[PDB]
Amino acid sequence: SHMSRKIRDLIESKRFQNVITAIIVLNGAVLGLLTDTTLSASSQNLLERVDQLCLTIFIVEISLKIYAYGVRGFFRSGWNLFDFVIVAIALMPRTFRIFRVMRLVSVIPTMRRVVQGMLLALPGVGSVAALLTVVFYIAAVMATNLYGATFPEWFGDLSKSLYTLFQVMTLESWSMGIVRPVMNVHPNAWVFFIPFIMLTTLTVLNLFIGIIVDAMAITKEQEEEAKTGHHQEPISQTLLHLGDRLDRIEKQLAQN
Amino acid sequence: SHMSRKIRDLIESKRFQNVITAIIVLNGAVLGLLTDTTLSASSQNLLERVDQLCLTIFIVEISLKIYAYGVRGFFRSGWNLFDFVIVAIALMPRTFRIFRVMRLVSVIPTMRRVVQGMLLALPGVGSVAALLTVVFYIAAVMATNLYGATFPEWFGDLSKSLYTLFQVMTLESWSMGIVRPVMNVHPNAWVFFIPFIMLTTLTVLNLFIGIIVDAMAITKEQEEEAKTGHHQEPISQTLLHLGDRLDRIEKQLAQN
Amino acid sequence: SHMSRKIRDLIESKRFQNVITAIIVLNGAVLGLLTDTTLSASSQNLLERVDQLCLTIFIVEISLKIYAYGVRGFFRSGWNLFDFVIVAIALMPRTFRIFRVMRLVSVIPTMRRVVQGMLLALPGVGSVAALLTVVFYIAAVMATNLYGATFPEWFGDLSKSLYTLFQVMTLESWSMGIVRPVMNVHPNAWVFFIPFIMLTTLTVLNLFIGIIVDAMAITKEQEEEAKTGHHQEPISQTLLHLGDRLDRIEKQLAQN
Amino acid sequence: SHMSRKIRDLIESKRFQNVITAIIVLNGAVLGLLTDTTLSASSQNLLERVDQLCLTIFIVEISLKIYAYGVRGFFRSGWNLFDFVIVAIALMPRTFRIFRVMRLVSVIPTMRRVVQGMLLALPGVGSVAALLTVVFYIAAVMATNLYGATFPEWFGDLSKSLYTLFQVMTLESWSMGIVRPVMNVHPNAWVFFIPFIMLTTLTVLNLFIGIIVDAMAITKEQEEEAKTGHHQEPISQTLLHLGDRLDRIEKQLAQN
Ligand SMILES: CCCCCCCCCC(=O)N(CCO)C[C@@H](O)[C@@H](O)[C@@H](O)[C@@H](O)CO
Ligand SMILES: CCCCCCCCCC(=O)N(CCO)C[C@@H](O)[C@@H](O)[C@@H](O)[C@@H](O)CO
Ligand SMILES: CCCCCCCCCC(=O)N(CCO)C[C@@H](O)[C@@H](O)[C@@H](O)[C@@H](O)CO
Ligand SMILES: CCCCCCCCCC(=O)N(CCO)C[C@@H](O)[C@@H](O)[C@@H](O)[C@@H](O)CO
Ligand code: NA
Ligand code: NA
Ligand code: NA
């Protein structure tokens, strides 16, 4: 229909995106002002009405999209489903309303592309992340059995051990706060903690670098495709096509 | 005119740059000596006169440049505008006079190229930086509402929360100083702080690596252009021109 | 024989790997539950029987493999030898039974490939690691002689000095906890500690980056070979073969 | 002469390097044992004689080299000059004798190549290092003037400010130890310290990454040259030579 097509063009315009972005920012500002515990009853009531107005504008925006794309066509996108859930959970009584400021990511295409690159890079580091998880679990069981009776606040149970080993991997007071006090009772505890630090810092840096390198390459391809319609072909494909042109001319020269 | 041309050649010489660099260093040294609170009145007066002499030499230098390049031609460069502002603000009464040691960057071309590469890499990481800003704002609102009444020095208001979340992202006493004391009152606070650390450290490292990788490539191109007049063409352009030469010879062999 | 061939196909199936993986996870869960010191005698007895059952399943699995591959054929693989040692040490009475959760790495091929890439990258960083070791040894001898009599808990002997220099390299309380107290007695101690930090942080980051970059490239080749049978040839080999095709056609055109 | 040639072949053999390496290790071990303050007079005397024996073996080694290469030919190498200085300073009475364990780097060629790559990468990061130095100097002058009277232990003078800003750049107790106590007196001090941290951590990581990336590439070329006599030509040179072969065959086909 012509009407649904005029609505799609309104939705996909730069001005509509700018208005929705401004309402997300306004809603985020009123939720930030609502943290101020010194506000008067009238000021709080006013800010709650601005929040209610912002939420109504998002309802109109979402309904406008579902009509212009169709129920199955709208829910086909993960970003639209996210926008729908974020707005729908506010209707029908979580206390974390500030999470709808995440709509700045879903509404702005360049920010959406950064997050997409990070999410798409996750499967590729799954085995490095599983290796770190295995090391953490093994270390937490060992630390609990080794130090739980003598240092129960840090290692009294599996949950406590996982927490203090995460602190140890981040290098936060690992020695003055944790390992020197442990070594006063268990002199060889450095044999456990120093290899734990070497392994986890190497593995977490491998995990982070793997995410970053891949996310940057995916996002760069997505930026190229969003502007020109296509991305730069990999150097391997360029060299493959160069070799194909050489086979075509070699078959020639030989007998032609 | 011949005079303006002789002045331009004086300004663009290696000896003039070396003299201006020496005056910036001398001015920086006298401002560093002026921090010593034990100095006599005569010693302070002497150093203030050396500072005044340095500032007069920069006025002569700047005027010499504005005459030799023209008002619009001088202000066409951002570095010249910076040099002009830095010297002009000293005339007419900020207390931070030490900021004119930044002229070492604007005067030395290799240092100027490092800063240029860093500034030019900023637009390309704008979406990663905006994502970190969104995460910080959301986390600061949540932390204020969750912990502000029980830990008001760290999370009593939005400003306090942003400050302590910046400390938490840098891993500084995050656990022994902040999260273990918070968990004594809110046992599940690790559910907030550990994902906050994982997300912000990954995102800030993505931001820093993106700046560094791009700044290094831009600065390297600028060094090449400043020495030879041109930079190394990207491998994609070399492979494109190689494919063009193959099309020219294939059209040949086929029927020639 | 046909029987050994039917057993090999059972062992190499996805379902057999999934069952062995589930038994490793179950054994890891019962060893994690056994850390809970509040368990009843009956609960502990039950968990010890589940652990015994898991260990028997691994014995059947290992025996099944040794028969289907031969004694020399099974021990030809380092992963099979690891699986054998891990299970065999449990029979005949270390207290660290949780180390058999490392079998998740040896049993899952994608996790095995991550560890293989890390182990294979170690020879290539051996000289960077030896340089860090030389710097640590020299610094520990100097720190012991310089500060051992005045700060014996941190530098009283070589072992203590190596431990506190490892803490200093990780930047943990290096200044508020170690160097400011040392400088109260030895004012120029920053001349030792600040160059030590600059050198070791640069060298350890070189060591970690060298491991990560190489492990990622080796693991990526191993993933390619495990799926297609071969890996992507290096760009140097592609350009070498491209130059060979040009020599074949140049010898032609010249006189043909 | 034949004798000098037989001596050069002895010096350049793998067995002579292995003997000199073993004497460096032995000398390092006796200097490490000499740190033990509980040793008897006889044990100390014995270790000092082993140190004296090691030093005599290095004198014979150095003299053997100066005769076999000539005075100007020996001193032509920076490593030989280093080996000469290190041994010669021990004769004629620094207390840091442990520095002759640095001869492990000069004697072992693969370790020598790592250090060479790091030294050769230094000129290329000189402008990034100068930028960090300029930022540190400016910040130290500002911090001294801003906080020196209220926090004289940390910022009382330029030297104190440089030290605590180096601690702040390493993120060590930057907030709980330095900036929160400063903000109790100067509430806006975060406006100084947070941009200082952002700038210096970005710049020091740029400095470290620039050193590492270049040192790794130089060392890899040096390893290739030491084994085969030549290094891998850069991809740019391979593509340049590929384009030259295309010009030779295009001039042909056109009219041949
Ligand atoms: C891979 C990273 C995994 C990090 C998270 C692991 C710990 C999660 C469980 C947990 O933290 N607790 C269990 C829920 O009660 C709370 C405590 O057991 C523990 O945090 C102790 O530190 C307490 O003493 C705090 O007061
Ligand atoms: C993205 C990074 C953003 C980091 C900076 C955010 C905080 C900026 C505002 C601010 O720090 N203050 C507001 C100006 O008054 C001061 C305090 O609210 C706060 O710093 C508390 O820590 C006080 O208790 C200090 O004494
Ligand atoms: C390359 C990294 C090497 C790091 C490990 C070096 C130290 C290993 C030896 C060691 O730590 N000790 C010797 C065994 O007794 C124990 C103590 O000498 C020392 O840890 C002191 O800190 C004590 O005061 C602890 O209570
Ligand atoms: C680019 C990195 C530069 C870091 C090094 C800068 C400081 C060097 C000078 C120095 O540290 N001192 C001057 C020599 O006396 C000593 C003290 O002024 C200072 O260290 C204070 O912390 C004292 O209170 C220690 O007790
Ligand atoms: Na700390
Ligand atoms: Na740190
Ligand atoms: Na600390």
Numbering used by the authors:
A (entry chain A), B (entry chain A), C (entry chain A), D (entry chain A): -1 to 91, 100 to 262
Give the authors' words.
Voltage-gated sodium channels (Navs) specifically enable the passage of sodium ions across cell membranes, contributing to the electrical signalling in cells. Mutations in hNavs have been associated with a range of channelopathies, including pain, epilepsy, and heart disorders, making them major targets for drug development. The NavMs channel has been shown to be an excellent exemplar for hNavs as it exhibits highly similar functional, conductance, and drug-binding (similar IC50 values) characteristics, as well as sequence and structural homologies.
